[PDB]
Curated annotation (Swiss-Prot), chains A, B:
Belongs to the CobH/CbiC family. This is Cobalt-precorrin-8 methylmutase. Transmembrane segments: none annotated. GO terms for molecular function: cobalt-precorrin-8 methylmutase activity; precorrin-8X methylmutase activity. Keywords: Cobalamin biosynthesis, Isomerase. It comes from Leptospira interrogans serogroup Icterohaemorrhagiae serovar Lai (strain 56601). Its EC number is 5.4.99.60. One of its GO terms (biological process) is cobalamin biosynthetic process. Disulfide bonds: none annotated. Substrate binds at S15, R38.
């Protein structure tokens, strides 16, 4: 479930209350607001109240795949190191991150690409991008490879959590997921933070919020 | 060292230059600016250009500690699982984080405190707080206990990287360090992000930046 003192639980509920009060009126649904607020909570940055975008199917589609014990593929290790394994076992979700794998780094140097792009391709070769939750919280090149695989092959992940932070392709990487949404009738559900802002913590924030939402039947 | 494709590097340098051009004129020293920059990088948030405070001895003191394979205590796992062990082994630094421990979790429930405070205490009961680098990145209560120990007892860490993000005591925890600096002729060097903004991501960014500096001398 989760290990946190009753005090910590009080400090947290005390924060969410302040965050709600401060943010002011917003345009999210109850279920959605919880994810947005959770990001604000993880960063003390209120911009995620505006830059955060939640595909209409994002919550259901994601919580559903979570219960099926679907896999969770992250681009950077930190994201994994932030999830309570105990909470994940309940559903039986397997996690992945080939960013530091031997072959990935070998192909990346050879192909003159990035590790993130190559680990996304590795997860793809094992059919891991299928009906799963892909969390990109650091490498835009990763989120772009997904953009590509979606058009090229049909990869149909359960949910894309594209919140990479960057100054070069971060902005675009997220905009492109929105372009896929425009052209397709039934597009891949997503939760992304538009612009350059994002990061492992933002992603973890989202996962925890989603899990807690699932927990609440 | 650093496993990062030649491509990924050019992406970072392009990022750093963007950060520099955008930031504008600042009041930091060359070496110090690096640390600040690294934070803005990891977050795409330029507020850290104003909220970041670096003690006069924070850089020299912290690097010197690393060189001597000094311990590195963290308040949360997220931070350890974000530092390249390969680089620390060079100086032979040992990484610690008792926030997950059994006794720590226990003592916390009984004392009606937080796992964070109790883990700072356990770390205390090992002489791991002297000439060490204390990296607090999520629990203000951890930084507050550290402050208390600088007062009650004479613990003398080599560097306090106090960047806990929070809403209830974040602002205060960091301020209490500035107080000690005021009342003490010779205080413990710090690198903190004023206000209530912060996070393990910022912590790691600061550490990496430090390590890199260390690697250029
Ligand atoms: Cl809104
Ligand atoms: Cl990237
Ligand atoms: Cl980028
Ligand atoms: Cl990150
Ligand atoms: Cl300045
Ligand atoms: Cl705390
Ligand atoms: Cl707090
Ligand atoms: Cl954090």
């Amino acid at each position: 479930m989760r290990q946190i003192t009753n005090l910590g639980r009080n400090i947290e509920n005390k924060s969410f209350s302040i965050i709600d009060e401060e943010a002011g009126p917003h345009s999210f649904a109850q279920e959605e607001w919880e994810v947005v607020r959770r990001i604000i909570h993880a960063t003390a940055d209120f911009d995620y109240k505006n830059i955060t975008k939640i595909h209409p199917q994002a919550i259901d589609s994601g919580i559903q795949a979570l219960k099926k014990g679907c896999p969770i593929v992250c681009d950077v290790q930190m994201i994994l190191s932030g999830l309570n394994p105990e909470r994940l076992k309940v559903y039986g979700c397997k996690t992945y991150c080939f960013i530091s794998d031997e072959d990935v780094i070998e192909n990346a140097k050879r192909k003159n690409s990035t590790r993130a792009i190559e680990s996304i391709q590795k997860a793809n070769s094992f059919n891991l991008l299928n009906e799963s939750i892909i969390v990109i919280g650091n490498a835009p090149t990763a989120l772009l490879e997904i953009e590509k695989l979606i058009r090229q092959e049909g990869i149909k992940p359960a949910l894309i959590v594209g919140v990479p932070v960057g100054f070069v392709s971060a902005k675009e990487s997220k905009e492109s997921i929105l372009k896929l949404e425009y052209y397709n009738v039934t597009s891949i559900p997503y939760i992304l933070t538009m612009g350059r802002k994002g990061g492992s913590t933002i992603a973890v924030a989202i996962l925890h919020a989603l899990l807690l939402l699932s927990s609440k039947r």
